[PDB]
Structure 1
C-alpha cells in the first residue's frame, strides 16, 4: 500500500539540498518506505507530529538513531533522558527541566547578553568575518561551557563530541564510522568532566549533582545527566545562529524589519529554527503494530521523521519557504514535540535572541562576500563557512 523510495536521506546529495527530495517524500504519501535503509519515513507535519506525541507506540528507548538497541549495542551508554521512555524518562526530565528552568534563565541572561554585544562589537572591528567560526561557533563557546561550570582546559573536545553524537544517530556510513573511530579522546574528556568535583559551583553541572539529594535522581545517575548537556545543545545552537545570520544576509528586508524593532529578535531566531531546522531527522521505534496515515507498520520497525520537512509542509504552513520574522511560529517541530520536546529550548532561545538583538542594534548590513560552504552531518543541518561583511549602524 505504501510507496517505496530509493532516496537516501543520509547521502551527501541529500545534505547539500534536501528540499526537493523532501517534497517528493511528502507528496509520495503520509508514510513511505526507504529501501536504502529498511525504515519507514514520515515527512509531512501531521504524521511527524502524531509520531512525536505517541511515545508509547513510537518509543525512544530502542534508540533515536537508525540502530535498534534491541538488536545492536549502543555506541555509548544510553542517555537517561533522550533514550528513555516514560516512566524512566520522567524524573531525569524533571531535573533537567528545573536546571534549565525559566527561573534559571534570569541568572544567566545578563551575562549572555553582554557576551553577545561584546562579540558583535569585536566582529565589527574586523569587518569581514566568518559568521560560523567567528560568530555562530564563537559565541556559544564563550557562554555555555562557563555556564556549565567546565574548566578551561579540554574545551576543544566539545565541538567534536557534539558532532560525533549527532553523526552517530545516522546509519553506519562513512560519516558515522569515522566519527566513532576518532571518538576515544572526546569520550574520555566528556565523561571525566561529568564527575561532581570537575564542575564549578553555581553552574548547570553542579546543579544537576545537587538534585541527587531530592529523590529525583541518584548520585550515580548525575554524571550521565551532565553528559546530556555536553552532548546536545552546542551544534544545534551554533547551526541555528548561523542559519539566522544566513537568513538575514539572504533576506535583507527582514534584517531591516529586525533593525526597526529589535524586540523581534526572539521570534527571528525561532523562525530560523523553523526555516533551517538544525536537527533535520531522527527516529522512533514501534512497540506494536500501528496504523499511521492509513498505513500498517509492524512492531519493532524504525520510523524516520523529517523535522525540517514538517516545518516546510505547505499543508501546515503558508509560504513555508519564506523567512518571515513576524510569522506565527508556534507549532513548528524544530525543538520536537511532546514529552521529549527540547528541555534546553530556553537556553537555545536565550542565546539566539541576545545574539540577534546585538546584530539588530549594532549592524546595518550583512553581505555575503565569500564562498558559502555547507557542513555535513547525518542528522544536523548547518554551514561550515559563511563569509560576510558586517556594516556598522
Structure 2
C-alpha cells in the first residue's frame, strides 16, 4: 500500500535541485518508503504537520537524525532539548524560552540593528561582494557570538561545528563521515566555551547558567543547553539571511516592493524561510504502530519529514514557487511546529528583519554578477557563494 521509491534525499543530485523529486515524493502518496535508507517519508504539508504535532507517537528522544539512539551510539551526548521528549523536554525548553524571550530581544535589538546598518554601509562601499561570506556569514558572526558572550579567540570553530551538527543528522554518507572524522577540534572548542567561567556576563550563555537555581535545570545541565545555542543559533541564520538575499536578487519586483515599504522586512524574511527552508529535513521515530494518511507504520521506524516540501506543497499554498513578501506565511513549518518549534525564532527573525530593513533603506538593486555556488549539507540548504553587485539607493 505504501509506494517504494529509490530517491536519495541526501544525494548531491537531490541537493542540487530538490524540487522535482519533492513533487514526485508528494504525488506518490501521503507516506512513502525510501528504500535507499529504509525509512518512511512524508513530504506533503498535512502529514509533516501531523507528525510534528504528535510527539508521543513520533518521538525525538531516539534522535532526529537517521541514527536510532536505541540502536547506535550518538556521536555526541544527546541534546537535552532537541533530542528529548516531554516531560524531560519541558523544563529545559522553558529556560531557553525565557533566555530568548521578548525582554531579551528588547535588550539586543538596537545593537543588532546598528550592526546590520553598518554592514550594509560597508558593503555598499565595496559595491561588488559575496553575499554569503561578506553578508550572510559576516553579519551573524558580528552579532551572535558577542550576544552569547563568547571570547574572541576560537570563533573560527563555530561554523564548522554547526556544519558538522547538521551533516550528522544525515545518513552515514560521505558528507557525514567526513564531517565527523574532522570534528575533534571543533567539539573541543565548543564544549569548553559552554562552561560558566568562559561566558561573559550579560550574554545568552551566562543567562542559561543563571537559571540553574530555579529548579528548572541543574548546573550540570547548563553546559549542554549552551551547546544547543552554539549548535543551532548561527548557521541557521546564515542560511536564512542568505536565502532572503538570494530571493531578493532573483525577484527584483519584490525588492522594489520592500524598498517602498521597509516595514515589510520581517515578513520578507519569514517568506524567505518558507521559500528556501534552510532546515530541509528532520526525522522522528515511531513509539508504536501508527496509521498515518491511511498507511500503517510499525513501531521503532524512522520517519523523514520534508519541511521544504511541506512549505512548497500546492495542497496548502497558492503559487508555492513564488517568493511573495506580502504572503500570509502563518502555518509554514520552516521553524517546525508543536512542542519543539524553534525556541530561537525571535533571535532569527530579529536578525533577518534588521538586515532586510537595512537593505530596504540603503540598496536600490541587487544583481548577481558571478557564478552561484551551492553548499552541500545533509540537513541545511543554502549557498557557498553568491556574487552580487549592490547599487546604492
How many Å separate the matches in 1 of 2:141 and 2:217?
Answer: 28
Cα drift, residue 102 of structure 1: 1.1
**TM-score (structure 1 length as normaliser):** 1.00
How many Å separate the matches in 1 of 2:224 and 2:380?
Answer: 22
1:360 maps to: 360
Q: Which contiguous aligned blocks of 4+ residues in structure 1 show a shift greater than 2 angstroms?
A: none
2:171 maps to: 171
Cα drift, residue 230 of structure 1: 0.4
Cα drift, residue 363 of structure 1: 0.2
SS of the equivalent of 1:129 reads strand
SS of the equivalent of 1:230 reads helix
2:281 maps to: 281
How many Å separate the matches in 2 of 1:277 and 1:32?
Answer: 21
Structure 2, gaps ≥5 residues long: none
Deviations 1:95-128 (A, max 9, x none): 0000000111000000000000000000000000
Cα drift, residue 236 of structure 1: 1.2
Cα drift, residue 143 of structure 1: 0.2
How many Å separate the matches in 2 of 1:102 and 1:15?
Answer: 35
How many Å separate the matches in 2 of 1:236 and 1:213?
Answer: 30
SS of the equivalent of 1:231 reads helix
SS of the equivalent of 1:153 reads coil
How many Å separate the matches in 2 of 1:246 and 1:177?
Answer: 30
How many Å separate the matches in 2 of 1:298 and 1:62?
Answer: 15
**TM-score (structure 2 length as normaliser):** 1.00
Across the aligned residues of Structure 1 and Structure 2, the Cα RMSD in angstroms comes to 0.3
How many Å separate the matches in 2 of 1:249 and 1:202?
Answer: 37
Cα drift, residue 233 of structure 1: 2.1
1:77 maps to: 77
Deviations 1:38-63 (A, max 9, x none): 00000000000000000000000000
Aligned length: 393
How many Å separate the matches in 1 of 2:339 and 2:16?
Answer: 31
Deviations 1:5-39 (A, max 9, x none): 00000000000000000000000000000000000
How many Å separate the matches in 2 of 1:59 and 1:169?
Answer: 15
1:135 maps to: 135
Structure 1, gaps ≥5 residues long: none
Deviations 1:203-262 (A, max 9, x none): 000000000010000000000000000000211111110111111011000000000000
Deviations 1:177-213 (A, max 9, x none): 0000000000000000000000000000000000001
SS of the equivalent of 1:46 reads helix
